[PDB]
Amino acid sequence: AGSIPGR
Amino acid sequence: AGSIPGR
Amino acid sequence: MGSMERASLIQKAKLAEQAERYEDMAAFMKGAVEKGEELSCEERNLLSVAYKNVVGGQRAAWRVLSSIEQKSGPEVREYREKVETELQGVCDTVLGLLDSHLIKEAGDAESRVFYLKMKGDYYRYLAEVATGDDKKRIIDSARSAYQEAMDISKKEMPPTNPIRLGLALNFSVFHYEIANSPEEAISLAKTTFDEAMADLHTLSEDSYKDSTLIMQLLRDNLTLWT
Amino acid sequence: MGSMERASLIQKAKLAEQAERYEDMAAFMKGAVEKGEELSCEERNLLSVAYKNVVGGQRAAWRVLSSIEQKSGPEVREYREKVETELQGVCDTVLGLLDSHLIKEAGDAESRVFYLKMKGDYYRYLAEVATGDDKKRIIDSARSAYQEAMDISKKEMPPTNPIRLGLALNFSVFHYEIANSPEEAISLAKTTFDEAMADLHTLSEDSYKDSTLIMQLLRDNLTLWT
Ligand SMILES: *Cc1ccc(C(=O)NCc2ccc(OC)cc2)cc1
Ligand SMILES: *Cc1ccc(C(=O)NCc2ccc(OC)cc2)cc1
Ligand SMILES: [Cl-]
Ligand SMILES: [Cl-]
Ligand SMILES: [Cl-]
Ligand SMILES: [Cl-]
Ligand SMILES: [Mg+2]
Ligand SMILES: [Mg+2]
């Protein structure tokens, strides 16, 4: 499950 | 130009 | 970093990001925060990117070592503990910056929601490695920060706002991975996606790209969870 | 690392490699070297992999920053200087381990050639950033180490030996990139490749794979240089 990336 | 890798 | 100018710290954080020197980036942004002035939108992103990369590397290492430890002298446990302590120190540092004094001075929705999402995230990382008498308290600290951020974002931001979407994405990951509430995770991701879809007509081409990119991440999670 | 057992340092270096924690790996191997015992073949590889990864990251960062600096306040220069100093410190640390006392106790061709190749490599990295009254002395230090290693490897190792091949590969890169001797670089790479090709018939399937892998790197360089 992926969380948000910064860029 | 490539040098040697470790693995 | 007390002797370096705030503007120089910011400029060097941007250079460190270009050089993929994230530990340096984080130290520069820590110095910038400790100058005591509020952070701009761009500066908040630099702070977040820096620490997310640092702790992201530590989390990856901790998972490798925890896996070896579970398959199995004291060495593997000792080294996993060292990495774990270093990770906790970074999380505590970020949480300390939020508490002294970023959050209390953040009045606009865009800054306050962003910092509270950060607070939830770094308690979530603490919860990932927690196993003692305080895993429950850490989880509740993460939940409370995310919940306050959700409440503000629902009142103050449109459903396509990228900060609102990324907060909902991470809170859904919290529900699924930390809180053992997969139904809450799926419900949140699906309601977030649907309400954003219905607001896309209001957006410019560039804002549309920003929002649909994060909606795809919500969809990817739903596909994995269902 | 004086209070940790040598075997524990080695075990933790292997764990750090699995976790891609190369700074930790290098500190563990530095501690193992400082126990004062000679290193086994495997242990020499751990030492070399650890520091090659650490300095490899620093070199990549230095090149990003040097490029920005050349395109262009004092910030870019200041930060390139900080990275440069950190890189030089790592090179000096490795060179100090070789000099105290790995090389003087290395009597077998496989260990002595390996350490001298290392010595040439870390002076080469120092030469990459050198610009003062000592770039020439640093280049000669790299050349002298590589030359001593070549002389031993030609006398004591078959032409397909992977240490002999990787030494010749890196010495050819030294000639091309540092010493401004591209003809010497091409001649060395081509003679090394041809003499290895003629010795492949002696090898087992696994040794054949080890040697042909490095021969391909020599060929790749020749293709780039001609
Ligand atoms: C809290 C928060 C942080 C970052 C963003 C954001 O817009 N990140 C850029 C991005 C979005 C999606 C994506 O999918 C591959 C990559 C990058 C929003 C909210
Ligand atoms: C001095 C020295 C270090 C390492 C080696 C070696 O055998 N490295 C493994 C390797 C060789 C070639 C390659 O091409 C992709 C990858 C890895 C030899 C000598
Ligand atoms: Cl340890
Ligand atoms: Cl304010
Ligand atoms: Cl600096
Ligand atoms: Cl010896
Ligand atoms: Mg000032
Ligand atoms: Mg002992």
- If we measure between CA atoms, which residue out of D117, A2, D159, D214 comes closest to residue C173? A2
The CATH number that applies at residue C89 is 1.20.190.20
Residues of C in contact with D22 (CB under 8 A): none
Domain annotation covers residue C1: no
Contact D19 C83 (CB under 8 A): yes
Domain annotation covers residue D31: yes
Ligand 3 centroid vs C100 CA: distance in angstroms?
31
Domain annotation covers residue C33: yes
| Preceding amide of C175 cis, omega within 30 | no
Question: DSSP 3-state helix, strand, coil percentages of chain A (rounded to 5)?
Answer: 0, 0, 100
Q: List, in order, residues 6 or more apart from C180 with CB less than 8 Å away.
A: none
Q: List, in order, residues 6 or more apart from D152 with CB less than 8 Å away.
A: D109, D112, D113, D116
Supply the DSSP symbol for C100: I
Domain annotation covers residue D1: no
Q: Which residue has the tokens 């701009």?
A: C40
Q: Give, for ligand 1, the residue of C124, C214, C216, C218 to mutate: max count of ligand atoms closer than 8 Å to Cβ.
A: C214
E-only strand ranges, C81-146: none
Q: Would you tell me how many other CB atoms lie within 10 Å of the CB of residue D6?
A: 16
For residue C96, what are its two tokens?
């300390």
Which chain C residue is nearest to residue D6, measuring alpha carbons? Answer: C75
Domain annotation covers residue D126: yes
* Residue D36 zone, left/alpha/beta (φ > 0; ψ -120 to 50; rest): left
For residue D21, what are its two tokens?
């924690």
Q: Which residue type does C6 have?
A: R
Domain annotation covers residue D36: yes
Distance between D32 CA and the closest CA of chain C, angstroms: 15
Backbone angles phi, psi at C187, to 5 degrees: -60, -45
Nearest to C177 among A1, A6, A7 (CB): A1
Give CA separation, D174 vs B1, C148, D178, in Å.
10, 59, 5
Nearest to B1 among D48, D53, D176 (CB): D176
Supply the DSSP symbol for C107: -
Domain annotation covers residue D88: yes
Q: Check if C203 contacts A (Cβ < 8 Å).
A: no
Distance from chain centroid for Cα D151: 17
- Secondary structure string (H, E, C) spanning chain D: CCCCCHHHHHHHHHHHHHCCCHHHHHHHHHHHHHCCCCCCHHHHHHHHHHHHHHHHHHHHHHHHHHHHHHHCCCHHHHHHHHHHHHHHHHHHHHHHHHHHHHCCCCCCHHHHHHHHHHHHHHHHHHHHHCCCCCHHHHHHHHHHHHHHHHHHHHHHCCCCCHHHHHHHHHHHHHHHHCCCCHHHHHHHHHHHHHHHHCCHHHCCHHHHHHHHHHHHHHHHHHHHHC
Which chain D residue is nearest to residue B3, measuring alpha carbons? Answer: D170
Best D55, D169, D186, D223 member to test B by mutation, with max B CBs in 10 Å, is D169
User: What is the spatial distance between Cα C140 and Cα C134, in angstroms, rounded to a whole number?
Assistant: 10
For this PDB entry, the determination method is X-ray
User: What is the spatial distance between Cα D66 and Cα D58, in angstroms, rounded to a whole number?
Assistant: 12
For residue D168, what are its two tokens?
């010749």
Distance from chain centroid for Cα C201: 28
Domain annotation covers residue C118: yes
Q: How many residues does chain D have?
A: 226
For residue D171, what are its two tokens?
């010495």
Per the structure, how many domains does chain D have? 1
Cα dihedral sign for D37, D38, D43, D49? positive
Q: What is the resolution of this structure in A?
A: 1.8
CA-CA-CA-CA dihedral for C174, C180, C184, C189, to nearest 10: 40
- If we measure between CA atoms, which residue out of D105, D96, D102, D210 comes closest to residue D164? D210
Angle at C17 between CA C12 and CA C23, to 5 degrees: 85
Angle at D219 between CA D216 and CA D225, to 5 degrees: 145
